[PDB]
Amino acid sequence: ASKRAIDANQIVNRMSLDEKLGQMLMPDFRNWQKEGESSPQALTKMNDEVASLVKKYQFGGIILFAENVKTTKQTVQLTDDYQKASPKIPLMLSIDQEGGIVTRLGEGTNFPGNMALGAARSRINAYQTGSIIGKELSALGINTDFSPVVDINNNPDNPVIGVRSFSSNRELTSRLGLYTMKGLQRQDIASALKHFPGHGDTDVDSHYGLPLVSHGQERLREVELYPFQKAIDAGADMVMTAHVQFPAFDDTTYKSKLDGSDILVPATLSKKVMTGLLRQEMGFNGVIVTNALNMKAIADHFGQEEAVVMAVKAGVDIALMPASVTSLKEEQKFARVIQALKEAVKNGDIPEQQINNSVERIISLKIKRGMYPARNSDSTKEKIAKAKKIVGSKQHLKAEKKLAEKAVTVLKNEQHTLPFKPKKGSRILIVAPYEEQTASIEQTIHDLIKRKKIKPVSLSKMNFASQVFKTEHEKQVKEADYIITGSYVVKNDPVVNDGVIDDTISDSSKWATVFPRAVMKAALQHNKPFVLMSLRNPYDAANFEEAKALIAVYGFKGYANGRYLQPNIPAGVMAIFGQAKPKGTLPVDIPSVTKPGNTLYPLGYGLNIKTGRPL
Ligand code: NA
């Protein structure tokens, strides 16, 4: 590893301060309003206006969004067109391909998500997930991924990250995060631990619109920072930092450049936090990178040019999205940002050696993940061919399937309700919040029929988001022979009275709690098989203590425009019809609604769908 250290330095010493500064910038070109074009457009394809700016400011990286990677053919092209534009050093192309409810690739393999991998628990599954996203990203020409999220969803009453997080436990989070990370690296992909110093239990400041952490240092070091520490020791490449007001480690305030008020310093802009805590006390010598510096709150309260400078002064190595430049009319923004830096350095506000370090860390990362020198040598056409047989491939899809199905978590199964074994002719009533969800379940039961794994049955759908359970809906439940219902909640806000959920109170506003619970009473009333499939946060499982079949899948996206947007719903359905073997155990604690203060389903709990005994 001492072979990168010198290599990197030999290189930095030969760069103009301007090539060094540009190399610490990583803007986004999500939307671009061309010359003499009516408005801004999703940038699907390169052009001389954007590429000029790359040649000119010589950025160190470009971050990509859903707009930029709509299709596999378009993506592999846009990447190679970027690499052409980049004058001297291979760009570091990055993206938020976490898996689960946060994916970006258009034709790529969306996985069950972190909280799913938590339920699955096996650390090999995590490593496979990263290894595949890695293969996929690598095949497109993307080399950096802002995953793993190692935030900890430890507070039901405040699930800021929820299913994007492995677990409510620090050890399960750090471990799974540890292996997702290593998975990605094995594919030669820069991996960035996400949301330092721990976004999972952030309060908010309604005044400024920033996340605030009010916890003291003992707590912070026990919980929030633990996952990051362990991954940092294990050789994390990058650490992404959120704009979180962080008073236990820095309670420096500034004057808002918009309010005049005394605003706490965001973690990102604090030398005590960036350099003091992360760089020194924690030992992180990788690349530090920040949330979008052009986020409104930040831009408005600290100023754009000023904020990027504060961040670099504070220790970050890569200022992400330093300004919002959509046209060539706005191109002088990048000039100013670099100019602020050039000046703050000339002044000795930022030692030249500090810049040389940062850049030497980027150049070291680029060398370490084979971005530098550029390791490929295939026609863009050939890259595209190779990519189409890799991104979204049947092999990957199978693994996605096995993983989603392994993660399904059975919480109740009284008297073998599951699996459903329908007679020919049986009517299955499918009930979810949105059409794309009832569609996914339907499409899945449909394949099972075409594949002769179940007798032919008849399906109707009921979509209840914002609805109230009225007579119409109840007649439709009598008609049914089998009922599959999806619950969807973030925070669990059942109307309740001394532990007794109140069912006599239904209004449109309470739909995510009152409605599915009304289906359930309706189905019990007429002696129907009813399983409940929770689609997001497992907390809603406390709403269905009377039910006899209950499962969690940790992923709510459905079926649309001919494509499955997530594996979770299908996997649930397969386990309901005895097709898959659900292994899942709770990666979080489900609080009881009927006996407040107690846990209803503890961490690690999960049933063997066949034997009925705790997995
Ligand atoms: Na490429």
Question: Three-state secondary structure along 20-40?
Answer: HHHCCEECECCEECCCCCCCC
Question: What is the distance in A from the centroid of ligand 1 to the CA of 51?
Answer: 15
User: Which tokens sit at 222?
Assistant: 């026990």
By three-state DSSP, how is residue 423 classified? Answer: coil
In DSSP terms, 559 is beta-bridged to 564
On the question of a common fold for 1-392 and 393-615, the answer reads no
CA dihedral sign of residues 281, 283, 285, 287: negative
> In sequence order, what are the residues at sequence separation of 6 or more whose Cβ sits closer than 8 angstroms to the Cβ of residue 65?
28, 30, 95, 96, 104
Question: What is the distance in A from the centroid of ligand 1 to the CA of 37?
Answer: 28
The residue assigned the tokens 């760069």 is: 15
Nearest by Cα to 306 from 355, 269, 345? 269
Question: What is the distance in A from the centroid of ligand 1 to the CA of 81?
Answer: 8
Nearest by Cα to 150 from 115, 101, 194? 194
In DSSP terms, 8 is beta-bridged to none
Question: What is the distance in A from the centroid of ligand 1 to the CA of 143?
Answer: 9
Residue 609 to residue 409: CA distance in whole angstroms: 9
Residue 350 to residue 335: CA distance in whole angstroms: 18
User: Which tokens sit at 148?
Assistant: 């793993």
Judge residue 596's burial from the number of C-beta atoms within 10 Å of its C-beta, 0-12 exposed, 13-18 middle, 19 or more buried.
exposed
Q: Sketch the domain layout of the chain as residue ranges.
A: 1-392, 393-615
Question: What is the distance in A from the centroid of ligand 1 to the CA of 384?
Answer: 8
Question: What is the distance in A from the centroid of ligand 1 to the CA of 50?
Answer: 17
Cβ proximity of 333 and 304 under 8 Å: yes
Identify residue 390 by its one-letter amino acid code.
I
The residue assigned the tokens 């803007």 is: 27
Question: What is the distance in A from the centroid of ligand 1 to the CA of 137?
Answer: 10
Cβ proximity of 322 and 25 under 8 Å: yes
Please report which helix (H) or strand (E) contains residue 368, including its range. helix 352-368
User: Which tokens sit at 169?
Assistant: 């436990």
Question: What is the distance in A from the centroid of ligand 1 to the CA of 129?
Answer: 22
Question: What is the distance in A from the centroid of ligand 1 to the CA of 24?
Answer: 22
Residue 612 to residue 339: CA distance in whole angstroms: 67
Question: What is the distance in A from the centroid of ligand 1 to the CA of 311?
Answer: 31
For the beta carbon of residue 14, count every other beta carbon within 10 angstroms: 9
Question: What is the distance in A from the centroid of ligand 1 to the CA of 376?
Answer: 8
| Radius of gyration of the chain, Cα coordinates, nearest whole angstrom | 26
How big is the chain, counted in residues?
615
Judge residue 278's burial from the number of C-beta atoms within 10 Å of its C-beta, 0-12 exposed, 13-18 middle, 19 or more buried.
buried
Q: What are phi and psi of 518, to 5 degrees?
A: -80, -40
Residue 28 to residue 293: CA distance in whole angstroms: 11
User: Which tokens sit at 497?
Assistant: 């009275």
Question: What is the distance in A from the centroid of ligand 1 to the CA of 463?
Answer: 42
Residue 167 to residue 162: CA distance in whole angstroms: 8
Question: What is the distance in A from the centroid of ligand 1 to the CA of 114?
Answer: 28
Question: What is the distance in A from the centroid of ligand 1 to the CA of 79?
Answer: 5
In DSSP terms, 496 is beta-bridged to 501
Question: What is the distance in A from the centroid of ligand 1 to the CA of 379?
Answer: 9
**Residue 121, Cα to own-chain centre: how many angstroms?**
18
Nearest by Cα to 451 from 579, 610, 575, 563? 579
Question: What is the distance in A from the centroid of ligand 1 to the CA of 91?
Answer: 11
In DSSP terms, 549 is beta-bridged to 413, 531
Q: Give 245's Cβ-side CA count (13 Å radius).
A: 22
Question: What is the distance in A from the centroid of ligand 1 to the CA of 331?
Answer: 26
Question: What is the distance in A from the centroid of ligand 1 to the CA of 75?
Answer: 8
Question: What is the distance in A from the centroid of ligand 1 to the CA of 126?
Answer: 26
| DSSP state at residue 426 | P
Cβ proximity of 428 and 483 under 8 Å: yes
Residue 261 to residue 252: CA distance in whole angstroms: 13
Question: What is the distance in A from the centroid of ligand 1 to the CA of 71?
Answer: 14
Please report which helix (H) or strand (E) contains residue 254, including its range. strand 253-255
Across 244-256, b (16+ Cβ under 10 Å) vs e yields bbbebbbeeebeb
Question: What is the distance in A from the centroid of ligand 1 to the CA of 378?
Answer: 9
Cβ proximity of 483 and 530 under 8 Å: yes
Cβ proximity of 223 and 169 under 8 Å: no
Question: What is the distance in A from the centroid of ligand 1 to the CA of 380?
Answer: 7
User: Which tokens sit at 283?
Assistant: 């030992």
Residue 99 to residue 228: CA distance in whole angstroms: 19
In DSSP terms, 431 is beta-bridged to 462, 485
Identify residue 229 by its one-letter amino acid code.
Q
Nearest by Cα to 321 from 297, 336, 300, 304? 304
Residue 170 to residue 150: CA distance in whole angstroms: 9
Please report which helix (H) or strand (E) contains residue 550, including its range. strand 549-552
User: Which tokens sit at 223?
Assistant: 């919980």
Nearest by Cα to 235 from 366, 368, 143? 368
Nearest by Cα to 532 from 404, 431, 406? 431
The coordinates were experimentally obtained by X-ray
Residue 596: cis peptide before it, omega within 30 degrees of 0: no
Instruction: Mark residue 108 as left, alpha or beta (left: phi above 0; alpha: psi -120 to 50; beta: remaining).
Output: beta
- Distance spanning both ends of the chain, measured CA to CA: 44
Question: What is the distance in A from the centroid of ligand 1 to the CA of 140?
Answer: 6
Nearest by Cα to 480 from 426, 416, 417? 426
Q: What are phi and psi of 46, to 5 degrees?
A: -60, 170
Nearest by Cα to 381 from 76, 71, 75, 70? 76
> In sequence order, what are the residues at sequence separation of 6 or more whose Cβ sits closer than 8 angstroms to the Cβ of residue 349?
309, 313
* Cα distances (Å, whole numbers) of residue 499 to 350, 370, 412, 542: 59, 58, 20, 11
Nearest by Cα to 32 from 17, 20, 43, 16? 43
Residue 471 to residue 490: CA distance in whole angstroms: 28
CATH number of 393-615: 3.40.50.1700
Resolution (A): 2.9
CATH class of the structural domain 1-392: alpha beta
Question: What is the distance in A from the centroid of ligand 1 to the CA of 86?
Answer: 13
Three-state SS annotation for 457-485: CEEEEEECCCCCCCHHHHHHHHHCCEEEE
By three-state DSSP, how is residue 600 classified? Answer: strand
Question: What is the distance in A from the centroid of ligand 1 to the CA of 176?
Answer: 29
Instruction: Mark residue 156 as left, alpha or beta (left: phi above 0; alpha: psi -120 to 50; beta: remaining).
Output: alpha
CA-based max dimension of the chain = 81
Instruction: Mark residue 316 as left, alpha or beta (left: phi above 0; alpha: psi -120 to 50; beta: remaining).
Output: beta
Q: Beta strand 190-196 with 144-145: parallel, antiparallel or unpaired?
A: parallel
Q: Give 482's Cβ-side CA count (13 Å radius).
A: 23
By three-state DSSP, how is residue 5 classified? Answer: helix
Question: What is the distance in A from the centroid of ligand 1 to the CA of 372?
Answer: 13
By three-state DSSP, how is residue 416 classified? Answer: helix
Cβ proximity of 287 and 317 under 8 Å: yes
Instruction: Mark residue 115 as left, alpha or beta (left: phi above 0; alpha: psi -120 to 50; beta: remaining).
Output: alpha
Question: What is the distance in A from the centroid of ligand 1 to the CA of 146?
Answer: 18
Please report which helix (H) or strand (E) contains residue 3, including its range. helix 2-12
User: Which tokens sit at 198?
Assistant: 């721990």
Question: What is the distance in A from the centroid of ligand 1 to the CA of 253?
Answer: 44
Question: What is the distance in A from the centroid of ligand 1 to the CA of 373?
Answer: 14
Three-state SS annotation for 276-332: HHHHHHCCCCCEEEECCCCCHHHHHHHCHHHHHHHHHHHCCCEEECCCCCCCCCCCH
Nearest by Cα to 371 from 107, 64, 94? 94
Q: Give 4's Cβ-side CA count (13 Å radius).
A: 17
Residue 186 to residue 365: CA distance in whole angstroms: 14
By three-state DSSP, how is residue 238 classified? Answer: strand
Cβ proximity of 295 and 2 under 8 Å: no
Nearest by Cα to 429 from 418, 445, 417? 445
Nearest by Cα to 182 from 229, 218, 234, 140? 234
Question: What is the distance in A from the centroid of ligand 1 to the CA of 78?
Answer: 8
Residue 519 to residue 474: CA distance in whole angstroms: 7
Question: What is the distance in A from the centroid of ligand 1 to the CA of 68?
Answer: 13
Q: What are phi and psi of 430, to 5 degrees?
A: -100, 120
Cβ proximity of 319 and 308 under 8 Å: yes
* Cα distances (Å, whole numbers) of residue 214 to 217, 221, 261: 10, 13, 19
Question: What is the distance in A from the centroid of ligand 1 to the CA of 80?
Answer: 4
Question: What is the distance in A from the centroid of ligand 1 to the CA of 332?
Answer: 29
* Cα distances (Å, whole numbers) of residue 26 to 319, 474, 509: 6, 55, 42
Question: What is the distance in A from the centroid of ligand 1 to the CA of 134?
Answer: 14
Residue 473 to residue 480: CA distance in whole angstroms: 11
Residue 148: cis peptide before it, omega within 30 degrees of 0: yes
Question: What is the distance in A from the centroid of ligand 1 to the CA of 187?
Answer: 15
Question: What is the distance in A from the centroid of ligand 1 to the CA of 287?
Answer: 23
User: Which tokens sit at 149?
Assistant: 């999220």
Question: What is the distance in A from the centroid of ligand 1 to the CA of 84?
Answer: 10
Question: What is the distance in A from the centroid of ligand 1 to the CA of 362?
Answer: 20
Chain breaks in the chain (C to N over 2.5 A) after: none
User: Which tokens sit at 609?
Assistant: 């769908």
Q: What are phi and psi of 134, to 5 degrees?
A: -65, -50
